[PDB]
Amino acid sequence: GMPRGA
Amino acid sequence: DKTFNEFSSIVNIVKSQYPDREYELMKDYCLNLDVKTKAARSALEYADANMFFEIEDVLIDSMISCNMKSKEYGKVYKIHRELSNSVITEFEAVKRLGKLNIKTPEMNSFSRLLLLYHYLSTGNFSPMAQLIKQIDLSEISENMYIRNTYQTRVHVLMSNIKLNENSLEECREYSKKALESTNILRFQVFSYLTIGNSLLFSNYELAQENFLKGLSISVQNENYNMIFQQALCFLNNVWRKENKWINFESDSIMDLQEQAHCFINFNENSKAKEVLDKLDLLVHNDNELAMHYYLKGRLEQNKACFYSSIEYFKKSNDKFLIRLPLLELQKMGENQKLLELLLLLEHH
Ligand SMILES: [Br-]
Ligand SMILES: [Br-]
Ligand SMILES: [Br-]
C-alpha cells in the first residue's frame, strides 16, 4: 500500500 | 553549572556546530537534566518529536516518579507511548487521559495530538478533522519550544488530513509550512512523504523528486529509508512502470500488496493470486482492507470487489486512495451518475 506518517 | 529559558537555544547550537553528533550530545545533555525543570519538559518533547524513544522513556519514568507540571507531562506522554505500542486500546487511552484532569494548555494540546497519530496509523481518518480543530496553540504561553514544535506537528497532521480529503493543493501548502517551520528530521521526512503522496496520481516526476529528497535526508535511518522505498514502490505501481523498489523479502501487508500490484500490472496473475492468497490471512485495518479489495478487483475483474473497496475507503474516510477503484469502475463502463452518487454519500 501507500506509506503514511506525520 | 543552568539552562536556557528556551530549549531551542541549545538545540540550534548543537545543530549548527556538531550536527553529526546531535544524538550523542543531546542524549547526554537531556538525561542529566533535573526532571523538575522546563528544560527537561522541553527535552521530553524534543525526544518524542525525534522518535528518540530511549531518551524519552527514561525522562517519562523519572518525571512520573518524582513536580506538578512535570508529572502531568510524563503521564500523558506515557499514554501516547503505550497507545502507539498497542499496550492500551484507544478506549483505555481516552479513559486515562480523562482521569488525569489535564490542566496545562501544552498537555491538553498533546492529548489531542496523540489520538490524531493513532487515528492516522490505524487508518481511521474520520475523527481527525474535528479533533484537530479543538487544538489552540495560542493558549501555550510559557514554553515556546513546545508551542513551535507542536505547530510543526499540526502542520504535518493538517497536511495528512487534507490529503485524506483529496484537497491536494492545501495538503502541499501545509507540508511546505511544516518544512519552513522546522529543523527536526522526523517532520521533514513526513512532509516530503506527504507532498510526494499528494502528487501520486498526477505528477510522476515531482512525486519521485519529493520521495528521493526524503531518501537523501533519511540515509542513516533504516526506518525512514524504508518508508521512502515503500513510497517509491507504490508510485511506480500506480503508474504501472517497471518497479525497482519491491521488497520481495517481506511479509508486511504494505510490501506484499505492492508485490501483487506489480504482478497484476505485468500480467503475472498466478503469482499475484499467491500473494493475495497470503494476504487474506492477515488482520487489515479498514484502509488496508480497501486496498486489498482493489487488488482483488483488478485480479478478478470483478466489480463487487471494487464496490467493497470503496466501502472501506468510505469507512476509513479516505477520499484520496478511493480514486483507484473508482478509476477501475469507470474503465468497466460503470454509470457516471452512480459514481457521482457514491462520492456524494458518506459512511456513518
Ligand atoms: Br517526589
Ligand atoms: Br513484479
Ligand atoms: Br472481492
Residues in chain B after which the backbone breaks (C–N beyond 2.5 Å):
1, 66
Cell digits of residue B156: 504535518
> What is the DSSP code (8-state) at residue B113?
H
Residues of A with Cβ-Cβ distance to B234 under 8 angstroms:
1-3
- Side chain identity at residue B316, one-letter code: S
Q: By the 8 A CB rule, do B140 and B147 touch?
A: yes
Write out B199-263 in H/E/C secondary structure: CCCCCHHHHHHHHHHHHHHHCCCHHHHHHHHHHHHHHHHHCCCCCCCCCCCCCCHHHHHHHHHHH
Q: By the 8 A CB rule, do B218 and B187 touch?
A: no
Hey, is B332 helix, strand or coil?
A: coil
Angle between helices B90-100 and B68-84 (to 10 degrees): 170
Ligand in nearest proximity to the CA of B63: 1
Identify the closest residue of chain A to B321 by CA–CA distance: A2
- Side chain identity at residue B177, one-letter code: K
Q: How many residues does chain A have?
A: 6
Chain center to CA of B212: 18
Q: By the 8 A CB rule, do B285 and B321 touch?
A: no
Does the CB of B260 have a partner CB in chain A at under 8 Å?
no
* Closest CB to A2 among B153, B159, B197: B197
Report the gap between the CA of B239 and the closest CA in chain A (Å): 13
Q: By the 8 A CB rule, do B62 and B49 touch?
A: no
Contacts of B304 (CB under 8 A, 6+ apart): B297
Q: By the 8 A CB rule, do B256 and B250 touch?
A: yes
Count of beta carbons in the 10 Å neighbourhood of residue B267: 8
Method: X-ray
* Closest CB to B117 among A1, A2, A6: A6
The runs of H, that is alpha helices, within chain B are: 8-17, 22-30, 38-49, 53-65, 68-84, 90-100, 105-121, 128-133, 144-164, 168-180, 185-198, 204-218, 222-238, 253-265, 269-279, 286-300, 303-316, 323-331, 336-344
Q: Which of B329, B322, B276 is nearest to B299 (CA)?
A: B276
Structure resolution, Å:
1.9
Q: Tell me the CA distances in angstroms from B170 to B119, B176, B213, B235, B248, one per residue in order.
A: 20, 10, 20, 21, 35
Q: Cell 510490501 appears where?
A: B255
Ligand in nearest proximity to the CA of B304: 3
Count of beta carbons in the 10 Å neighbourhood of residue B65: 10
Residues in chain A after which the backbone breaks (C–N beyond 2.5 Å):
none
